[PDB]
Design a protein around this nucleic acid. Sequence first.
RNA 1: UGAAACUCAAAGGAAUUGACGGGGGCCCGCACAAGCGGUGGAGCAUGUGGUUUAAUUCGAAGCAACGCGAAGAACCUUACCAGGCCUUGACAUGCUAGGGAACCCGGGUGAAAGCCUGGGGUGCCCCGCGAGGGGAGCCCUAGCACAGGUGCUGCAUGGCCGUCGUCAGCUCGUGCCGUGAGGUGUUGGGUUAAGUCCCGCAACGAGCGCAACCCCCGCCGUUAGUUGCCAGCGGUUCGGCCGGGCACUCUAACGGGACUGCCCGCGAAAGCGGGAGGAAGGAGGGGACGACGUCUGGUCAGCAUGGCCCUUACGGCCUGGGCGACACACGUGCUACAAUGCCCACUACAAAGCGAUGCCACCCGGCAACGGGGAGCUAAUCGCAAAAAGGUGGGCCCAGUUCGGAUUGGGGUCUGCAACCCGACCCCAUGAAGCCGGAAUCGCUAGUAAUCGCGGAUCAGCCAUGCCGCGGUGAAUACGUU
RNA 2: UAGCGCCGGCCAACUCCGUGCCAGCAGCCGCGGUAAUACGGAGGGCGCGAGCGUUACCCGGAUUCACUGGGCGUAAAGGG
Lengths: 151, 206, 60, 112
Amino acid sequence: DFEEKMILIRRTARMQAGGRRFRFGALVVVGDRQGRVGLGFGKAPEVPLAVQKAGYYARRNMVEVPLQNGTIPHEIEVEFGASKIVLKPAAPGTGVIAGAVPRAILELAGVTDILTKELGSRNPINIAYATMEALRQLRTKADVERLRKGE
Amino acid sequence: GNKIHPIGFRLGITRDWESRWYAGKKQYRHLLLEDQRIRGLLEKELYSAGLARVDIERAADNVAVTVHVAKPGVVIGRGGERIRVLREELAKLTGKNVALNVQEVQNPNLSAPLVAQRVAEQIERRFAVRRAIKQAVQRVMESGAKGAKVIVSGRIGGAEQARTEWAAQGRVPLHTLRANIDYGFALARTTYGVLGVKAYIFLGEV
Amino acid sequence: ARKALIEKAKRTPKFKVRAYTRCVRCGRARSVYRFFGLCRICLRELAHKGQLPGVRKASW
Amino acid sequence: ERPKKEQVRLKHELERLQKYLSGFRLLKRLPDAIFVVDPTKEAIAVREARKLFIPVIALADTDSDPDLVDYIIPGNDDAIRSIQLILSRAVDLIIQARGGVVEPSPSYALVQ
RNA sequence: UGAAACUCAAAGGAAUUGACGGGGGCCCGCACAAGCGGUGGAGCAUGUGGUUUAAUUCGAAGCAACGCGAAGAACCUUACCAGGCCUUGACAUGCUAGGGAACCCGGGUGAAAGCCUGGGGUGCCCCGCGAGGGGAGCCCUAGCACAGGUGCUGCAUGGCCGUCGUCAGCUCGUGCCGUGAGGUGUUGGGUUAAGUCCCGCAACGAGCGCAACCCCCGCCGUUAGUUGCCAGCGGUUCGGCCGGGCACUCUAACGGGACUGCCCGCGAAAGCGGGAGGAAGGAGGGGACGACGUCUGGUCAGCAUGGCCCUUACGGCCUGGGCGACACACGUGCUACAAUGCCCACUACAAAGCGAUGCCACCCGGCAACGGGGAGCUAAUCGCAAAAAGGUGGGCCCAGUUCGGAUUGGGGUCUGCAACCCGACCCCAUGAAGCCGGAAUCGCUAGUAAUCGCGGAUCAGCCAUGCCGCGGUGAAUACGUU
RNA sequence: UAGCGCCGGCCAACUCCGUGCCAGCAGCCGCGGUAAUACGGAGGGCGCGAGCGUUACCCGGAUUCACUGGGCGUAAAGGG
Ligand SMILES: [Mg+2]
Ligand SMILES: [Mg+2]
Ligand SMILES: [Mg+2]
Ligand SMILES: [Mg+2]
Ligand SMILES: [Mg+2]
Ligand SMILES: [Mg+2]
Ligand SMILES: [Mg+2]
Ligand SMILES: [Mg+2]
Ligand SMILES: [Mg+2]
Ligand SMILES: [Mg+2]
Ligand SMILES: [Mg+2]
Ligand SMILES: [Mg+2]
Ligand SMILES: [Mg+2]
Ligand SMILES: [Mg+2]
Ligand SMILES: [Mg+2]
Ligand SMILES: [Mg+2]
Ligand SMILES: [Mg+2]
Ligand SMILES: [Mg+2]
Ligand SMILES: [Mg+2]
Ligand SMILES: [Mg+2]
Ligand SMILES: [Mg+2]
Ligand SMILES: [Mg+2]
Ligand SMILES: [Mg+2]
Ligand SMILES: [Mg+2]
Ligand SMILES: [Mg+2]
Ligand SMILES: [Mg+2]
Ligand SMILES: [Mg+2]
Ligand SMILES: [Mg+2]
Ligand SMILES: [Mg+2]
Ligand SMILES: [Mg+2]
Ligand SMILES: [Mg+2]
Ligand SMILES: [Mg+2]
Ligand SMILES: [Mg+2]
Ligand SMILES: [Mg+2]
Ligand SMILES: [Mg+2]
Ligand SMILES: [Mg+2]
Ligand SMILES: [Mg+2]
Ligand SMILES: [Mg+2]
Ligand SMILES: [Mg+2]
Ligand SMILES: [Mg+2]
Ligand SMILES: [Mg+2]
Ligand SMILES: [Mg+2]
Ligand SMILES: [Mg+2]
Ligand SMILES: [Mg+2]
Ligand SMILES: [Mg+2]
Ligand SMILES: [Mg+2]
Ligand SMILES: [Mg+2]
Ligand SMILES: [Mg+2]
Ligand SMILES: [Mg+2]
Ligand SMILES: [Mg+2]
Ligand SMILES: [Mg+2]
Ligand SMILES: [Mg+2]
Ligand SMILES: [Mg+2]
Ligand SMILES: [Mg+2]
Ligand SMILES: [Mg+2]
Ligand SMILES: [Mg+2]
Ligand SMILES: [Mg+2]
Ligand SMILES: [Mg+2]
Ligand SMILES: [Mg+2]
Ligand SMILES: [Mg+2]
Ligand SMILES: [Mg+2]
Ligand SMILES: [Mg+2]
Ligand SMILES: [Mg+2]
Ligand SMILES: [Mg+2]
Ligand SMILES: [Mg+2]
Ligand SMILES: [Mg+2]
Ligand SMILES: [Mg+2]
Ligand SMILES: [Mg+2]
Ligand SMILES: [Mg+2]
Ligand SMILES: [Mg+2]
Ligand SMILES: [Mg+2]
Ligand SMILES: [Mg+2]
Ligand SMILES: [Mg+2]
Ligand SMILES: [Mg+2]
Ligand SMILES: [Mg+2]
Ligand SMILES: [Mg+2]
Ligand SMILES: [Mg+2]
Ligand SMILES: [Mg+2]
Ligand SMILES: [Mg+2]
Ligand SMILES: [Mg+2]
Ligand SMILES: [Mg+2]
Ligand SMILES: [Mg+2]
Ligand SMILES: [Mg+2]
Ligand SMILES: [Mg+2]
Ligand SMILES: [Mg+2]
Ligand SMILES: [Mg+2]
Ligand SMILES: [Mg+2]
Ligand SMILES: [Mg+2]
Ligand SMILES: [Mg+2]
Ligand SMILES: [Mg+2]
Ligand SMILES: [Mg+2]
Ligand SMILES: [Mg+2]
Ligand SMILES: [Mg+2]
Ligand SMILES: [Mg+2]
Ligand SMILES: [Mg+2]
Ligand SMILES: [Mg+2]
Ligand SMILES: [Mg+2]
Ligand SMILES: [Mg+2]
Ligand SMILES: [Mg+2]
Ligand SMILES: [Mg+2]
Ligand SMILES: [Mg+2]
Ligand SMILES: [Mg+2]
Ligand SMILES: [Mg+2]
Ligand SMILES: [Mg+2]
Ligand SMILES: [Mg+2]
Ligand SMILES: [Mg+2]
Ligand SMILES: [Mg+2]
Ligand SMILES: [Mg+2]
Ligand SMILES: [Mg+2]
Ligand SMILES: [Mg+2]
Ligand SMILES: [Mg+2]
Ligand SMILES: [Mg+2]
Ligand SMILES: [Mg+2]
Ligand SMILES: [Zn+2]
């Protein structure tokens, strides 16, 4: 129902007497291009089944994202153990400038202006997971004063 | 790497003799020889309709020829031509009394030799092997059936190396006698040559 | 010598000695049963196909 | 139909089929909350519930993890005394909030 | 303390799945142990390596190639070789042109194929009374399209098959776990032939496997009475031959019957042990059945097929040869080395199966094989049939023997046009190595091994000791899992 | 006047013949051992255009000397 877009479909494998069989990684992002977004990573002995499966998980794990005219509120750095990612706010006409992964994220996020970089590791998977969290830690001016109130 | 022909395995049960009559140490040899070539000519001019099974009967110049088809219209014509022309050309080459009976096929999606000749085509017509094979099953299963399985083998996509693509859904106990599992086979010619096709349809039981 | 092979197998232009069997289908020369007029292999296929009256899987 | 043989197992199933489901089988939707006797013990449930954002309530001794319970019943929970007392009034509360309050089932003798 | 040139596309950490270990634990299979017989020695048969040849066609390669394709190589077969001959063909479809119908018969020729070639002949369609011709089939011959290829690639491939292995395994859906490959489930306690079942459990359940449903064999009942039966009476050329009957035998369909069901013990259960009853018990015996997948296994020579290559020839025909060569090496086999035996006479007890120009009863002739006559039988009716080992009687007396029957000579029958190369059998004579086999090695756990015959596929006949199946007599031994 | 680079992956652009570990390609990974989207020619396509490619060197990527902005149990690294 939202939008759909996969980042990669790798074929892993495994040993076993007489040969090797393979499952199939499949990372997919999904979003309404309007704040609601969710990432998903499915696995199965079939490419289609795999993407299909990533679809189910995608809409499950979701996250609202505080969009200021297509940009992000404040800048944030979030290290998912291995890799690390930066995210910066930018005026209209800047565009989504990032590696292929965080793009899928931010694009299907409804984001349209943002400076970013992948420092550290770069494993697509981990950078994925990383960004999700990062957005999941963005906070609107309200959230701030709302917590910083406690009336 | 074995697997006997499910049919021959269920001969004393389930699947009856496609050709069924009787003779002796003098006739069997020819009656079969002829019976065969008759089925051959029918495979030729008749497949164009979904020629699956082709039952046969004989004894003393009597000859049944009940040919079951998914599209009977093509074996009949408009009212007595396509059906008759064959009766003609048939006995026009046999010294016997024929009878080109025609049954229908209430549902092709439940007849292996049909499912087979089907997926056998799309490959010849160069198409998505995985997709098509998997679709045939999801057709046969969605079509209401207790089990189904289909498999090609050869140069899938036209690669150098051989291969074989597996696909099946719902129970298909090939080891059990009380099972009735329509078996289907079909060729497939391409630029890169031969390609086998197999079909299995678990239906009845007990 | 395989097409002209099977033709000569019918003619017997000379002594009945040169008369020899021939699988009706495969055109095999050896392992041909007089009863079916067929080679061992093809018949295995027909028997499985059920296209052989009475012929049935034996076991005892 | 059904030979004597099939009857045996087939029925035997039903027994344990009930031996675990008889009390869960009346649930058909999907719980709105979960009452738990000892949190730490059946903490596996708490996790299932928690993830599905189902509210947690439970009796819990000191051997317990107070923070992951949404509505806590601190106190003994290894002895029949506290357990029967809590569940009693708890259910009576449910019945009363509903309609037709009565008198607690056998349990005081069960206490012996 | 501490470089460089040069050079590499890695070096490397942790974790994952799997394979391997002269690591471990639990467990199994004629795996070893126990035990019986046997190959390796000899002769011969058969396949293979090698060499040889004009050619000795090709494939198969440790287990899982080697009596394997080949369930029948004198010519056929035949893919090889030599020589003779055709070169739109031995077979397909088509287009077209000239002559003849179709069809049948012959002669010269040659090794046969093939090539030269006389005769008979004149049907069916159109026009016409005829003539004459034109049209169909069919053949000669011309041409084109095209045939044909057991020529190559199984490392292009379908199909089929071998194999690990009848091993108990392989895996899926959702959930949960892990950044992830992945894990769980499937593990763990008990149980079994078994992922058999119980029990437990972050899993719950499902699928292909195992079992069960199908066939044979064991006990018994139903239906059927041209097999068997004096069971029972009567007649008897005293033979179940005639009457008579189906009971029993048997023939073949269908059904009963066993399920740890019952008793007793242990056990949470599953199950286990022992007892009865029972023809049969803990899967009663034998079959069919062989998972995901493994081996760039096997096979393009069964057939099919991508590509390639040939095209008066890499195609086709005949005659002859070869596949059967022999200084040699191995694999499977047969017959033996003799007294628990060889011989000869005479007498008895099966099964499954096959057979109407096939099985051939009986007579005749022959030492014989085999031939001549000849009845029956499309067959639970007649026939291949004598089963053989067994049983009783006689002979040999420890020897290369009356053991053993190889080799060679001589004479003969039968198949098939033809038995030089190359068949099978008969009779006489000839009578070989071999006195139980080095290092090494195979089979089998009970109606089994050993042993003894009978049949069948193939096929004119047969190089069958081979294969597939059948019954007869009928053991030994398994303390144990190092 | 219209030219040049490229069309296996990074990287936008696919077929055919030839070829056969040779002729050759190459920036990294690799490609060619009779059937190559990777050699070479062709047809077609992508890119740029009075240019297009190559070689050389500088900064970038390189948070690979880390001030911004890294590390040192086992990966290179705690001094006995
Ligand atoms: Mg919408
Ligand atoms: Mg929407
Ligand atoms: Mg879509
Ligand atoms: Mg996850
Ligand atoms: Mg789903
Ligand atoms: Mg909000
Ligand atoms: Mg928000
Ligand atoms: Mg770090
Ligand atoms: Mg990288
Ligand atoms: Mg990396
Ligand atoms: Mg938020
Ligand atoms: Mg918010
Ligand atoms: Mg077809
Ligand atoms: Mg079509
Ligand atoms: Mg088949
Ligand atoms: Mg012959
Ligand atoms: Mg033959
Ligand atoms: Mg058929
Ligand atoms: Mg509810
Ligand atoms: Mg609900
Ligand atoms: Mg708190
Ligand atoms: Mg009490
Ligand atoms: Mg240094
Ligand atoms: Mg240095
Ligand atoms: Mg120096
Ligand atoms: Mg191994
Ligand atoms: Mg052994
Ligand atoms: Mg055994
Ligand atoms: Mg031993
Ligand atoms: Mg020996
Ligand atoms: Mg020897
Ligand atoms: Mg050998
Ligand atoms: Mg010489
Ligand atoms: Mg060959
Ligand atoms: Mg050879
Ligand atoms: Mg042979
Ligand atoms: Mg020649
Ligand atoms: Mg012609
Ligand atoms: Mg023309
Ligand atoms: Mg002549
Ligand atoms: Mg004359
Ligand atoms: Mg006419
Ligand atoms: Mg007419
Ligand atoms: Mg006319
Ligand atoms: Mg007319
Ligand atoms: Mg007329
Ligand atoms: Mg007229
Ligand atoms: Mg007239
Ligand atoms: Mg006239
Ligand atoms: Mg006409
Ligand atoms: Mg005509
Ligand atoms: Mg192979
Ligand atoms: Mg194959
Ligand atoms: Mg295994
Ligand atoms: Mg496992
Ligand atoms: Mg597992
Ligand atoms: Mg344990
Ligand atoms: Mg099971
Ligand atoms: Mg009886
Ligand atoms: Mg009497
Ligand atoms: Mg009397
Ligand atoms: Mg009496
Ligand atoms: Mg009588
Ligand atoms: Mg019963
Ligand atoms: Mg019990
Ligand atoms: Mg007992
Ligand atoms: Mg049994
Ligand atoms: Mg068995
Ligand atoms: Mg079974
Ligand atoms: Mg292979
Ligand atoms: Mg080979
Ligand atoms: Mg070939
Ligand atoms: Mg070929
Ligand atoms: Mg071909
Ligand atoms: Mg040539
Ligand atoms: Mg030439
Ligand atoms: Mg006679
Ligand atoms: Mg006689
Ligand atoms: Mg005489
Ligand atoms: Mg005779
Ligand atoms: Mg005679
Ligand atoms: Mg009789
Ligand atoms: Mg015979
Ligand atoms: Mg004796
Ligand atoms: Mg004596
Ligand atoms: Mg001597
Ligand atoms: Mg004489
Ligand atoms: Mg000696
Ligand atoms: Mg002696
Ligand atoms: Mg014999
Ligand atoms: Mg014979
Ligand atoms: Mg024999
Ligand atoms: Mg360029
Ligand atoms: Mg570029
Ligand atoms: Mg591209
Ligand atoms: Mg060259
Ligand atoms: Mg070439
Ligand atoms: Mg090429
Ligand atoms: Mg190549
Ligand atoms: Mg390139
Ligand atoms: Mg090129
Ligand atoms: Mg161009
Ligand atoms: Mg300019
Ligand atoms: Mg630089
Ligand atoms: Mg630099
Ligand atoms: Mg820098
Ligand atoms: Mg660092
Ligand atoms: Mg430190
Ligand atoms: Mg260093
Ligand atoms: Mg110090
Ligand atoms: Mg110091
Ligand atoms: Mg140090
Ligand atoms: Mg020092
Ligand atoms: Zn055949």
